[PDB]
Write an enzyme that holds these catalytic residues in place. Structure first.
Site, short mmCIF file in Angstrom:
data_model
loop_
_atom_site.label_atom_id
_atom_site.label_comp_id
_atom_site.label_asym_id
_atom_site.label_seq_id
_atom_site.Cartn_x
_atom_site.Cartn_y
_atom_site.Cartn_z
N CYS A 29 42.54 29.03 30.76
CA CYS A 29 42.87 28.01 31.75
C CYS A 29 42.45 26.62 31.31
O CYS A 29 43.13 25.65 31.62
CB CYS A 29 42.26 28.33 33.12
SG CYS A 29 40.69 29.09 33.12
N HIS A 199 37.55 26.83 37.00
CA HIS A 199 38.83 27.31 36.51
C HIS A 199 39.68 26.05 36.49
O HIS A 199 39.62 25.26 37.43
CB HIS A 199 39.39 28.34 37.49
CG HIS A 199 40.89 28.43 37.51
ND1 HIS A 199 41.61 29.10 36.54
CD2 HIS A 199 41.77 28.13 38.50
CE1 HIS A 199 42.87 29.22 36.93
NE2 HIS A 199 42.99 28.65 38.12
N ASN A 219 48.76 26.34 38.98
CA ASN A 219 47.86 27.37 38.47
C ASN A 219 48.62 28.09 37.34
O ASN A 219 49.84 27.92 37.21
CB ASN A 219 47.52 28.33 39.62
CG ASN A 219 46.25 29.12 39.38
OD1 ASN A 219 45.58 28.96 38.36
ND2 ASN A 219 45.87 29.92 40.35
#
EC number: 3.4.22.1
Lengths: 253, 253
Positions: A29, A199, A219
């Protein structure tokens, strides 16, 4: 500055901006948030003339210690740093077969009852091969795309807003609580659940949804997670430190 | 820029620079690295004129959601924002009876054996009492000191150094592994160890141990942990994120 904004509308000719990818069973990520916004910006910087998916493979395998420890986690600012210096080749998605290095770690279900395999624990990091997949026209070297500058943006709404408006999407990060994992739509504020950790993500716009200000956020858990893989999060009160780690950069001409 | 540097000798008139606090049984290292650097800065910037221990207690307990979850952890950049907006009152160490709000959480032993009780994770956040302790000469609203600016420093070694050298110690953060916990001497490189989380600290200089370039760091774990409360960690390699998350600010004076 407008009351809401979308990078995808503002720069509709640039396709990568609407794209959602999958880091798979690998904590990349940090890598994704970066290579996504670079792609958006290379395109934005060039009025469309250049339209590359910058490789998540290249950055994740080839960066080194500066970016942290690969599929076990990494540091965004090391990403954009490596970009301004060693720079980054193109690379489509898993079995895309586009650009130099397509990403080589499979898609999976990230906390959602889908049909792909269960993701399960951070994958292990692959080695760095300074060579594009066979079939690709040019070599790794010739295929590099460079950052001119990179920087941290300060914890100020108006500032993070001015940056997205003038230069395109940015990379962010935030603490992740359990109650996040099953987000579906609307604006995420935190209420319950344990800590899971930071994240990294790509911020691409802002807005107001029923009284509530938000960041529009991509995301890297594929499109069957959340709101087509996107989500909104409280904007204004550093919610989960969403405004604490904005990193960005300008593509070289 | 100098090949070596110590804020402790650069501004020897500025005692807070040499001081090691103890955060106790509370995850307020985000608070401790900020008020520490803020004190240093209030002293350097008024050239000596103003000298205060900025209160950890005030930040930890009164900042709220923009900073995090208090004793469970938080966000440095929300600390420096708070200061610039709502100000911080003076507070010295536990049982100092110095300043407005001294720290209310006991010193303890932090991954060492010593005379003090062991620390715990279990750490409730004291409530936000907006009253200076009894005896204090001046009221809470009166005793507040304000930031003029807050800003993130980009991931550049040459840029981080020059901020310190021109403006004072900084707050920053790094990913802590379990091999860290039992450090004693020398320069930190993460060899073995398992992941334990972030740790917000204060950086106050740089140098070179046997070829190894390092940063001079004040931990907030009291002085019997590690090298009299300080440690050295390698430099130039974003090692464990050390150059990734640097925040600072200039006192209003």
């Amino acid at each position: 500055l407008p009351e809401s904004f979308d990078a995808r509308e503002q720069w509709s000719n640039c396709p990568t901006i609407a794209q959602i990818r999958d880091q798979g069973s690998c904590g990349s990520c940090w890598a994704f948030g970066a290579v996504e916004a670079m792609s958006d910006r290379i395109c934005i910087h060039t009025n469309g003339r250049v339209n590359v998916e910058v490789s998540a493979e290249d950055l994740l395998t080839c960066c080194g210690i500066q970016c942290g420890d690969g599929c076990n986690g990494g540091y965004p600012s090391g990403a954009w740093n490596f970009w301004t210096r060693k720079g980054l080749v193109s690379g489509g998605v898993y079995n895309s077969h586009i650009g130099c290095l397509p990403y080589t770690i499979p898609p999976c279900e990230h906390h959602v009852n889908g049909a792909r395999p269960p993701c399960t624990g951070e994958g292990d990091t692959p080695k760095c091969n300074k060579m594009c997949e066979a079939g690709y026209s040019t070599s790794y070297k010739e295929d590099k795309h460079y950052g001119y500058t990179s920087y941290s943006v300060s914890d100020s709404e108006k500032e993070i807003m001015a940056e997205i408006y003038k230069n395109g999407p940015v990379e962010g990060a935030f603490t992740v609580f359990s109650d996040f994992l099953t987000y579906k739509s609307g604006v995420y504020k935190h209420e319950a659940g344990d800590v899971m950790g930071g994240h990294a993500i790509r911020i691409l716009g802002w807005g107001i949804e029923n009284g509530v200000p938000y960041w529009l956020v991509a995301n890297s858990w594929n499109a069957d997670w959340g709101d087509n893989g996107f989500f909104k999060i409280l904007r204004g009160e550093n919610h989960c430190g969403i405004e604490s780690e904005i990193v960005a950069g300008i593509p070289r001409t």
